[PDB]
Design a protein around this ligand. Structure first.
Ligand SMILES: CC(=O)N[C@H]1[C@H](O[C@H]2[C@@H](O)[C@@H](NC(C)=O)[C@H](O[C@H]3[C@H](O)[C@H]4N=C(N(C)C)O[C@H]4[C@@H]3CO)O[C@@H]2CO)O[C@H](CO)[C@@H](O)[C@H]1O
Ligand SMILES: CC(=O)N[C@H]1[C@H](O[C@H]2[C@@H](O)[C@@H](NC(C)=O)[C@H](O[C@H]3[C@H](O)[C@H]4N=C(N(C)C)O[C@H]4[C@@H]3CO)O[C@@H]2CO)O[C@H](CO)[C@@H](O)[C@H]1O
Lengths: 497, 496
């Protein structure tokens, strides 16, 4: 089956209001950049972002000029003409609107509270979808927590049943309306709703993992923001998943979530597959079309894993724009982040950056020896290893943030589409490296094991293995005369074939 | 409030059926051994053991001479004329009857299975009590598994209900009928029901921790069977509590249950105090009035922490009675155990035993260099530390197994009584030592702390402390944006 290539397209309210396709200083990446050929390279385009208002309904930023809004959305849906399988989704949320301290957080929390609120909210979603010509709904709430999860789940199920009904009504069987969500790509944020992944992913066509921003100025050590696999030399973190209300024993939590561990894309992907009820075909690996910059980095190792003098606040607190050659940073007032387009132009501008590569993480990075600068980003090369990882692990596909950050030619998007569909591209021999793989094993992804059936009245020595009621259990100590199961003496280690 | 001195009194069916107070060769320790003075040193005497028959009711061993039984119990209850606080309880269970593989194990599992079965069993308990003149019921099921816990609890609740009624009906406000159980004194067995300790203890006056047998020939290395505190040189064990059906986070589990750890009396007490709703006042520390012997030990550390060649199976697998000087071992046909009374005689018989003392575990032990023997046991000296510990931890009192193993002078009983009630005894200067203390912290033994009230809307760095809902919490990582109890990044680390 074809792999999904979901490209979020972010366009600020301000830009929508002053929309033009002839003034790169106003709209840096207009829709006019996506040609029929480029449209053919995508399966989904996720317009970002819509939000939830105080009325507990899906809506545009009130400051948005509606007519200009519909116009931007029209240029996008027009692309469907050049791709019968292309879907134009709209995403609700985004870090700014939905984070705990986001301006609209209460709206997300409140909308999902009751059957009534969920019905009204879900209905507003379908209205908006049909009103502007979208093909599905994507929720990017970062992120539901504690008591919020069940509501969130009920909301997703509700939206689902409505979409499915709309599909029938609109006779859209050939291109069903879809529901997706952008999920956390790191254990910390993932720990919030992890225990209920299955229920959450159940009504979805895809869960888009935000496997990036796994490094940044808000961390004390420089590192790759999207390492595919781990580098022992890089930092590690406490595995927040073992703080999730799972009901697993100490042993289970320990074997499921090793810690410390390398925060990588592989880890996020594996942590999702660990859970029972989470199909890999629904998992979509996210990749960044932007890089994150650090300053005050010590030399000796390309700027990797170094202490740094980079502010972690938001917004950027100074007026000092130290990312050499990043004019985009000056315009946007943040030297800590830059689009691939800008980064590429920087490597083009002979500014002193060296383009380095980590063979463990399988990602590139820039080192400015002179100014002590470090940039972590992804490119067509790192995407090769990730595209193959997607095939190998049989994931639903690839997602990226975001379309407007690709170079004018759209090399990043073309690469992705190429690695999955091009007849003349061949990665059968691409070596995935020796980077550290996430090997947590939880009661959900238990391996098939073989052991004599348990025998009542028998006393077992420590480390003894037996099969009982569909599983292979092992004793954590000796003289155990209890049966495998509820009692704490036995550890479920495998599944009975 | 007076510390409880609970002495179990075990008399085998054979000894009851041949009861005599004038022949130590038949009944080694008849009731007449408990003189008025000794009766005053006790608060409870738990008659052991009664069982649960196939009719799923409490009942005396089938082969028991009822008439002889009642005479023995009457002698015991007669003892009350010398101590108006004394209670003669009877204990149902014991290892032989109720262990997973014991003769009556099925009866314990079934007796508590249904409301009807529990109702019937509960009533049989009170009936036996009122019928033989006992003062309370002690359940010694070693031990109910995780699925039988809720029924065990319901059964205790049912028994508590009937006893409180009987107390009124019999006008026993002054000396209310009681309900206790012999609880595990080690994590492994404790882990079976640990998670529901609170519910188990609720209906009880006391939970008698069998904080002994923490070592034996069934373990690869010789060790102190009842060390008060841990000795780094000694063996450590897997902390089974971290595998209990607690539903706690890794962080919570790891701080409550360090592993490996030292299998000690302190460890057991702390493990109980760690749970919420488990009052120290109801915790009673068990002490043994018997020692455990090993053979084929090597020297270098007085026979401690040495490999040995002692068989572990019950019954003793041979007729080789190697405990030198232990005639009791010949009679009972097991050289791996000796009453304190027997040990004392072995020590005074100059058979080549040396009484050494571990100042970390605060316990005595015998080492026979010639034959390579090792004996772990307790005495009046180790009882000083445990008695102080009982006081310092504000525990309910002490319990021991069993009266019949003390010496004719009732020295161990006397020691316990003295350490708690003698006006001329003073242990304020007694040094508890540097032996390893159990350091686990749980929901029920959280430290008192002070921290700034959590402030909605604030972002907290890793390691921050805030007060919320009467507790102090700490963040497990950084950029914590939500409140304690709603965001799993918060760990409850203190109270008040
Ligand atoms: C404040 C506001 O609403 N708009 C800002 C705008 O904010 C953007 C940027 O900060 C984005 N960062 C980057 C590197 O693009 C940020 O992107 C987040 C997004 O919210 C999350 N959602 C996803 N999905 C895959 C759905 O991924 C993440 C990405 C980061 O990877 O989004 C916010 C808006 O929430 O920033 C611009 C200039 O930076 C500013 O002019 C203004 O328009
Ligand atoms: C096997 C039997 O029924 N009768 C045996 C008798 O068995 C005793 C002994 O093995 C006791 N052991 C010791 C060291 O005294 C054993 O005591 C156990 C008891 O079951 C548990 N209950 C408690 N409580 C505090 C309630 O503590 C433990 C103690 C060990 O600390 O009990 C069994 C019976 O269950 O052994 C004698 C002598 O070998 C034999 O003649 C015969 O009467």
């Amino acid at each position: 089956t074809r792999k999904a290539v979901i490209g979020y397209y972010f366009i600020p309210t301000n830009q929508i209001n002053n929309y033009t396709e002839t003034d790169t200083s106003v709209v840096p990446f207009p829709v006019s950049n996506i040609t029929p050929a480029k449209a053919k390279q995508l399966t989904h385009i996720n317009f970002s972002f819509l939000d939830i208002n105080s009325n507990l309904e899906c809506a545009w930023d009130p400051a948005t000029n509606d007519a200009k809004a519909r116009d931007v959305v029209n240029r996008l849906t027009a692309l469907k003409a050049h791709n019968p399988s292309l879907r134009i989704m709209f995403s609700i949320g985004g870090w700014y609107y939905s984070n705990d301290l986001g301006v609209s957080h209460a709206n997300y929390v409140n909308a999902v509270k009751t059957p009534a609120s969920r019905a009204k909210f879900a209905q507003s979603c379908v209205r908006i979808m049909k009103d502007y010509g979208f093909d599905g709904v994507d929720i990017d709430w970062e992120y539901p927590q504690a008591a919020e999860v069940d509501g969130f789940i009920a909301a997703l199920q509700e939206i689902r049943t409505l979409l499915n009904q709309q599909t029938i009504t609109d006779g859209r069987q050939a291109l069903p309306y879809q529901l997706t969500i952008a999920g956390a790509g790191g254990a910390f944020f993932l720990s919030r709703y992890y225990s209920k992944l299955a229920q959450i992913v159940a009504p979805l066509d895809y869960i888009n993992l935000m496997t990036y921003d796994l490094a940044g100025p808000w961390e004390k050590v420089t590192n790759h923001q999207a390492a595919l696999f781990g580098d022992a030399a890089g930092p590690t973190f406490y595995n927040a998943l073992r703080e999730a209300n799972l009901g697993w024993s100490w042993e289970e939590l320990t074997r499921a979530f090793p810690s410390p561990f390398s925060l990588t894309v592989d880890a996020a992907v594996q942590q999702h597959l660990m859970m029972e009820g989470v199909p890999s075909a629904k998992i979509v690996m996210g990749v960044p079309f932007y890089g994150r910059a650090f300053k005050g980095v010590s030399g000796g190792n390309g700027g990797q894993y170094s202490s740094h003098s980079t502010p972690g606040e938001d917004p950027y607190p100074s007026t000092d724009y130290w990312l050499v050659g990043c004019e985009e940073c000056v315009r946007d007032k943040d030297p800590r982040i830059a689009s691939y387009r800008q980064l590429e132009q920087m490597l083009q501008g002979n500014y002193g950056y060296q383009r380095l590569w980590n063979d463990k993480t399988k990602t590139p990075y820039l080192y400015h020896a002179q100014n002590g600068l470090f940039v972590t980003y992804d490119d067509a090369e790192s995407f090769k290893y990730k595209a193959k990882y997607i095939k190998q692990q049989q994931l639903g596909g690839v997602m990226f943030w975001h379309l407007g950050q690709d170079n004018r030619n759209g090399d990043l998007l073309a690469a992705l589409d190429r690695y999955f569909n091009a007849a003349d591209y061949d990665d059968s021999q691409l070596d995935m490296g020796t980077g550290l793989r996430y090997t947590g094993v939880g009661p959900g992804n238990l391996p098939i094991m073989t052991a004599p059936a348990y025998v009542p009245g028998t006393t077992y020595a420590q480390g003894a293995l037996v099969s009982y009621q569909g599983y292979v259990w092992q004793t954590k100590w000796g003289y155990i005369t209890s049966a495998p199961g509820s009692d704490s003496a036995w550890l479920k280690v495998g599944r009975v074939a």
